[PDB]
RNA sequence: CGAAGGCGACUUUCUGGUCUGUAACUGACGCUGAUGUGCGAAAGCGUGGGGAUCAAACAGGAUUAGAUACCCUGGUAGUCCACGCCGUAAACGAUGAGUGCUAAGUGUUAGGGGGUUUCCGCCCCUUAGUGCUGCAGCUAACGCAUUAAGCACUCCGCCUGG
């Protein structure tokens, strides 16, 4: 699914205040778990948890 | 009026220049890369502020900066010893703020940090 | 699902064959809804762009199946094109 | 279906009354017509990760929607930064 | 953002190095400034999970 | 993934379509080919930007016993995006697109059946592919091959001197 903003409870190891994702082999995941890692976390991680750049 | 001054250092890979300024923008003076015989962007050497920036800082004597806080926006060889002119007369190098911006990002581009 | 919003809202008059899944005579004149409905399937955030040729060779699919019925029997596609509200 | 999951934070340089004037909407008005903020998903003092609102701590009240219709999320995506207890939003169609 | 004290400045050769690289999204930082080519990196751009 | 040129920031979209596990079902309802389908990258291409970067020109420098050139900031446009594209690339597969195999193997993205469930992992079946090799076949050889440069049923076009 598209895990929402507080839906990083067992995933804030992956979340960061300042920009750290774990890619595929970093968690040993396939192309659904890594994919939620890289897309579905972002609703919590990017919009008001990561200043990209100015 | 002591303990007030920042060596806000605009040092890239070259161009070891640093303003011996206040903690915020008022800009007293400097021994920068246009100050100790050089011009800048080939001064990848500390002698902007190897020795002769604390010449300026102690000719001022108003900072008394126990915290001189070189603030960088890039690399530089002479920048780690651009703070030797904050150790020469000994103004107690205490911080290294080597950061590029992360405010956020105006529009269909103007531009800002990478 | 089998898109019962339309695929089996139109069966109320177009379930001409039972086990109507698959019997192409069932999906007789369901092409009428996707004129602007698929333009809303796209235009919100746009590009279901080749859905134009999709819907139009779907009209072609009607040519493939309703004429297959015409060959099965002419009175079939007559009932579906003469007495039907989508005429000719 | 335009189901908008709206990451909104309050401008956290606020009092509970200024929170109240805007989060009294995000339980009932965001329950209008299948908008369904599922409950008071407006938690207390969180941590403002990327610093906005010139306030150094996060009072992360956020509107969460899992639906298909999602009526009244536009009613504070329009009130997003005009607000005194919302800052931003997320434009997300989710069928 | 970094304050390091208690170090010499002819020894600042070692103090100016160690707060740089640590970021898993070091790219998703950079976003909207200065964007480049993978040409010689097409040896290694069939790559993991970007969109395929 | 697209008709291709090609397709890249991400929250999202249509998830269109791939996609494999189910496929719930009337009775040839398709490939190529009159139709017709669209564009195809740039050099260049019909408006503000554009000389901001880069940048030809010019400057200006000079190797050792040789420039204005490798050298380029000011800088000529151009570069570039909000209104028009050509039908060209090593778009090369030098290898056209339907029915199916050629001992087959191979680890694997997807989606599944699962045992064991693990602590989300070990083992078996799996295919669009993914690669790897590798049987037959292949041509002179390059070298191709369960996914052709083979094998038996479809069309296309090419040309039998250039």
Automatic annotation (TrEMBL), chain A:
- Physiological role: Binds as a heterodimer with protein bS6 to the central domain of the 16S rRNA, where it helps stabilize the platform of the 30S subunit.
* Family (UniProt): Belongs to the bacterial ribosomal protein bS18 family.
- This chain's protein is named Small ribosomal subunit protein bS18
Q: Which domain of life is it from?
A: Bacteria
Q: Which UniProt keywords apply?
A: Ribonucleoprotein, Ribosomal protein, RNA-binding, rRNA-binding
One GO term of the biological process aspect: translation
An example Gene Ontology molecular-function term: small ribosomal subunit rRNA binding
Q: Which GO terms describe its cellular component?
A: cytosolic small ribosomal subunit
Quote the range of the complete protein represented. 24 to 77 of 80
Q: How does it assemble?
A: Part of the 30S ribosomal subunit. Forms a tight heterodimer with protein bS6.
Q: Tell me which stretches of the chain form a coiled coil.
A: none
Automatic annotation (TrEMBL), chain B:
Entry superkingdom: Bacteria
Q: Does the keyword Cell cycle apply?
A: no
Q: Which GO terms describe its biological process?
A: translation
InterPro entries membership: Ribosomal_uS11, Ribosomal_uS11_bac-type, Ribosomal_uS11_CS, Ribosomal_uS11_sf
Q: Which GO terms describe its molecular function?
A: rRNA binding; structural constituent of ribosome
Which Gene3D superfamilies does this one have? Ribosomal protein S11
Q: How is this protein annotated for GO cellular component? A: ribonucleoprotein complex; ribosome
- What are the UniProt keywords, alphabetically? Ribonucleoprotein, Ribosomal protein, RNA-binding, rRNA-binding
Q: Which family does it belong to?
A: Belongs to the universal ribosomal protein uS11 family.
Q: What HAMAP family does the record point to?
A: Ribosomal_uS11
- Oligomer status and interactors: Part of the 30S ribosomal subunit. Interacts with proteins S7 and S18. Binds to IF-3.
Q: What does this protein do?
A: Located on the platform of the 30S subunit, it bridges several disparate RNA helices of the 16S rRNA. Forms part of the Shine-Dalgarno cleft in the 70S ribosome.
Q: What is this protein called?
A: Small ribosomal subunit protein uS11
Q: Which organism is it from?
A: Staphylococcus schweitzeri
UniProtKB/TrEMBL annotation, chain C:
* A cellular-component GO term for this protein: cytosolic small ribosomal subunit
Tell me yes or no: is RNA-binding among this UniProt entry's keywords: yes
The record's keywords, sorted A to Z, are: Ribonucleoprotein, Ribosomal protein, RNA-binding, rRNA-binding
One matching Pfam family? Ribosomal_S15
Instruction: Tell me a GO biological process for this protein.
Output: translation
Please name the InterPro entries in this protein's record: Ribosomal_uS15, Ribosomal_uS15_bac-type, uS15_NS1_RNA-bd_sf
Which molecular function terms from Gene Ontology are attached? rRNA binding; structural constituent of ribosome
- Ranges that cross the membrane: none
* Family indicated by similarity: Belongs to the universal ribosomal protein uS15 family.
Q: What does this protein do?
A: Forms an intersubunit bridge (bridge B4) with the 23S rRNA of the 50S subunit in the ribosome.
Q: Which PANTHER family match?
A: RIBOSOMAL PROTEIN S15, BACTERIAL AND ORGANELLAR (PTHR23321), SMALL RIBOSOMAL SUBUNIT PROTEIN US15M (PTHR23321:SF26)
Q: How does it assemble?
A: Part of the 30S ribosomal subunit. Forms a bridge to the 50S subunit in the 70S ribosome, contacting the 23S rRNA.
Name this protein carries in UniProt: Small ribosomal subunit protein uS15
TrEMBL record, chain D:
InterPro entries, sorted: Ribosomal_bS6 (IPR000529), Ribosomal_bS6_CS (IPR020815), Ribosomal_bS6_sf (IPR035980), Ribosomal_S6_plastid/chlpt (IPR020814), Transl_elong_EF1B/ribsomal_bS6 (IPR014717)
Per the UniProt entry, what is one GO biological process?
Answer: translation
Q: Per its UniProt entry, which superkingdom is the organism in?
A: Bacteria
Q: Which GO terms describe its molecular function?
A: small ribosomal subunit rRNA binding; structural constituent of ribosome
For this UniProt record, give its keywords in alphabetical order, as a comma-separated list. Ribonucleoprotein, Ribosomal protein, RNA-binding, rRNA-binding
Q: Name one GO cellular component term.
A: ribosome
Signal peptide start and end residues: none
The similarity annotation says: Belongs to the bacterial ribosomal protein bS6 family.
- Function according to Swiss-Prot or TrEMBL: Binds together with bS18 to 16S ribosomal RNA.
Q: Which NCBIfam families match?
A: S6
Q: What is this protein called?
A: Small ribosomal subunit protein bS6
Instruction: From the UniProt record, report the name of the gene that encodes this protein.
Output: rpsF
